[PDB]
């Protein structure tokens, strides 16, 4: 007996504790002239597609260090609006010289970053903050710095001076920082159909939806590049009846996850908690999820993480389904051998010859 969030949630509270009732079609959640936003680069023909020149970016990687980006927008979706920044202007020139597409590393709801500001500390902030949030730092080889009025960034540059293979002090402190930072790639799905809240100015409520859309409009209109969303349907961040991040396995136990044939343990071939795109309702979840990112978020293409773990039939089914919302949608992924051929014809480089799905 437990209260669980919706797997079909489209809006959430801070740290995805509660699902929110939302209407993605609301003008209030749209940047000005969202309804008339078009794809800057064509994707209709094979010749149109072949022109595709992808730049795989990450929200923090883009604006975390750029000083020309207003402080409050660093490591945010809204950073792409800082028209007069080194990063924005750089992308602007790359776009002008031929980079056609922007690929976004996990921007769906990741589990691996605390969305509560006060339970997190980044290198930009004083070392004291690190100790307040991180219990471990108070009892480590760096405990002495909690007293210093210097930032984590500062302390890190200091450690470089004597960093060597025999004294790897820079990485030792970083390991601890990394537990309470805002930095993760995000290949840890909590909710598939909601944007990540930590990349938003305020993660409580709908704010993230307007902000994300605002970033899409900036990328397509102001930077003139299409958008590819990196997707992770191969696994869930957790399963079981206790994990905070188990959503799917708390609602329909033993259904959504791929289990070992003997033990019923959730397999971890992908890392983490192997999902089951071979099961009908999870295949439906995936398709319905992609529909939302397709029409409500105006995404031009999708890159499937460890796509080999998906059945070729599912990828093709989802593709035909999504094509009815956007006929020029592109699907590609990592089609390596997953070792699931005993279970179904895998969506692999070999198996996808002539399907249209890229690898």
């Amino acid at each position: 007996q437990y209260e669980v969030t919706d797997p079909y949630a489209h809006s959430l509270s801070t740290n995805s504790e509660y699902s929110q009732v939302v209407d993605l079609n609301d003008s209030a959640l749209k940047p000005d002239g969202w309804d008339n936003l078009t794809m800057p680069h064509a994707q209709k023909t094979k010749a149109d597609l072949a022109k595709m020149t992808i730049h795989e970016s990450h929200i923090r990687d883009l604006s975390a260090w750029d000083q020309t980006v207003p402080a409050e927008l660093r490591g945010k979706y809204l950073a792409l609006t800082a028209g007069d920044s080194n990063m924005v202007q750089h992308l602007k020139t790359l776009s002008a010289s031929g980079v056609t597409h922007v690929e976004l590393l996990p921007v769906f709801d990741l589990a691996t970053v605390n969305e509560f500001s006060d339970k997190v500390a980044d290198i930009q902030q004083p070392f004291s903050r690190l100790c307040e949030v991180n219990s471990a730092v108070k009892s480590s080889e760096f405990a002495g710095y909690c007293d210093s009025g210097s930032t984590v960034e500062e302390v890190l540059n200091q450690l470089k001076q004597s960093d060597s293979q025999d004294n790897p002090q820079v990485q030792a402190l970083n390991t601890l920082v990394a537990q309470t930072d805002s930095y993760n790639w995000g290949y840890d799905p909590f909710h598939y159909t909601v944007p990540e809240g930590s990349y938003a100015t305020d993660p409580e409520g709908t704010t993230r939806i307007k902000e994300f859309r605002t970033m899409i409009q900036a990328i397509k209109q102001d930077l003139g590049m299409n958008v590819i969303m990196d997707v992770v349907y191969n696994h869930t961040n957790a399963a079981g009846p206790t994990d905070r991040t188990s959503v799917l396995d708390k609602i329909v136990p033993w259904y959504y996850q791929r289990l070992n044939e003997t033990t019923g343990s959730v397999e971890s071939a992908t890392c983490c908690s192997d999902s089951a795109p071979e099961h009908r309702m999870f295949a439906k979840l995936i398709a319905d999820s992609l529909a939302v990112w397709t029409t409500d978020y105006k995404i031009d293409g999708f890159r499937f993480d460890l796509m080999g773990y998906h059945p070729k039939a599912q990828i093709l089914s989802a593709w035909e389904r999504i094509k009815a919302l956007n006929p020029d949608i592109y699907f590609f992924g990592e089609g390596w051998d997953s070792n699931q051929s005993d279970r179904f014809e895998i969506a692999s480089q070999i198996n996808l010859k002539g399907t249209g799905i890229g690898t």
Binding site: G240, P241, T242, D243, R244
Partner: protein, 355 residues
């Protein structure tokens, strides 16, 4: 009051007179492990006392299933106690465990009668504590006589009701435990004078140091009892769904009492927000023992016991990175399974039988 654990830990039973007071050793007098010159207790006889003690530690329940002295799965009511069903209760709250009370010999006096000539003052102090741990760390209600924390003696008086201030003396200035202060009442203990003389001088009388050592041990045990809701489950059904024992069966090591308490997902709700499970280990043996049962389990000694240090009952307890526990002689350890970021699987019970 439950006489089952009482008699198993203390040794013998009431009405014992003469050499039987020495011959009938207990788990805490070293029955089997460290026998005295008069002892003739068999291995099965000693194993049966372990069976009764375990049942008692799990709140002496009639329906609690355990692995007996022979390896059979038996309900608590199926374990004999002098012709009676050992286990009888529905909930541990219906049972009062004890190893000392106003009536009959004090715990110390019983150890003095029952301990091997080899057991020095230091081991006998720990013998008292070990005896008390079975009560203090068990699911049933903990009861004890005033003075047990000060190695209380009545200089072998059995029925001290009218033995006045002299025999019933409790020194709160901690100079002595009132041991060897005279021969007890002839009328009721005369028949035991020959046994008293044989044992009386076997070991030195406790002093300020020993009483302080025992008080420290007593305070340790009670602190532990209040350190987790897992020690005091209250409901019989909770006991059965969470409590189990290791070092059970025909092949069992004598004097080793190992109790496991689940807070894992299979038990139900997370009762302790800090723990996933508990281990109570009582090594009532003169040889140090080893625990490979918790193979690769990430355990830690109680903070209560770690704070105690050299004065801990766990002093010398080793927990190898590989989950192996080394338990020193006459020692008690509370090994705890820390909870991660969520209730994991802990120490699930065998679930060998129900009802």
């Amino acid at each position: 009051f439950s006489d089952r654990l009482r008699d198993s830990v203390r040794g013998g039973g009431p009405f014992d007179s003469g050499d039987a007071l020495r011959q009938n050793q207990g788990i805490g007098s070293g029955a089997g492990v460290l026998p005295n010159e008069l002892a003739s207790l068999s291995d099965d006889q000693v194993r049966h006392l372990a069976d009764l003690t375990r049942l008692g530690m799990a709140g002496n329940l009639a329906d609690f299933v355990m692995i007996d002295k022979d390896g059979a799965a038996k309900k608590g009511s199926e374990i004999d106690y002098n012709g009676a069903p050992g286990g009888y209760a529905a909930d541990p709250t219906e049972v009062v465990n004890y190893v000392s009370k106003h009536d009959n010999q004090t715990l110390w006096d019983m150890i003095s009668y029952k301990a091997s000539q080899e057991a020095d003052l230091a081991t006998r102090v720990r013998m008292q504590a070990v005896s008390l741990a079975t009560v203090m760390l068990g699911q049933g209600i903990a009861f004890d006589q005033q003075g047990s924390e000060l190695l209380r003696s009545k200089s072998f008086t059995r029925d001290s009701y009218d033995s006045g201030d002299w025999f019933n003396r409790v020194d709160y200035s901690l100079q002595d435990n009132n041991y060897n202060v005279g021969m007890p009442r002839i009328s009721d203990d005369g028949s035991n004078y020959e046994v008293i003389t044989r044992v009386k001088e076997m070991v030195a009388t406790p002093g300020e140091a020993e009483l302080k050592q025992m008080t420290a041990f007593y305070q340790e045990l009670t602190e532990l009892r209040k350190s987790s809701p897992l020690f005091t489950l209250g409901d019989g059904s909770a006991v059965m769904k969470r409590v189990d024992f290791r070092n059970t069966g025909s092949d069992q090591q004598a004097g080793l009492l190992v109790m496991t308490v689940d807070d894992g997902m299979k038990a139900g709700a997370s009762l302790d927000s800090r723990l996933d499970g508990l281990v109570v280990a009582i090594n009532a043996a003169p040889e140090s023992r080893t625990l490979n049962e918790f193979a690769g389990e990430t355990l830690q000694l109680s903070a209560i016991q770690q704070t105690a240090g050299e004065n801990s009952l766990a002093n010398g307890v080793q927990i190898a990175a590989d989950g192996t526990v080394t338990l020193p002689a006459w020692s008690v350890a509370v090994l705890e399974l820390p909870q991660g970021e969520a209730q994991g699987a802990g120490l699930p019970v065998s679930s060998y039988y129900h009802h």
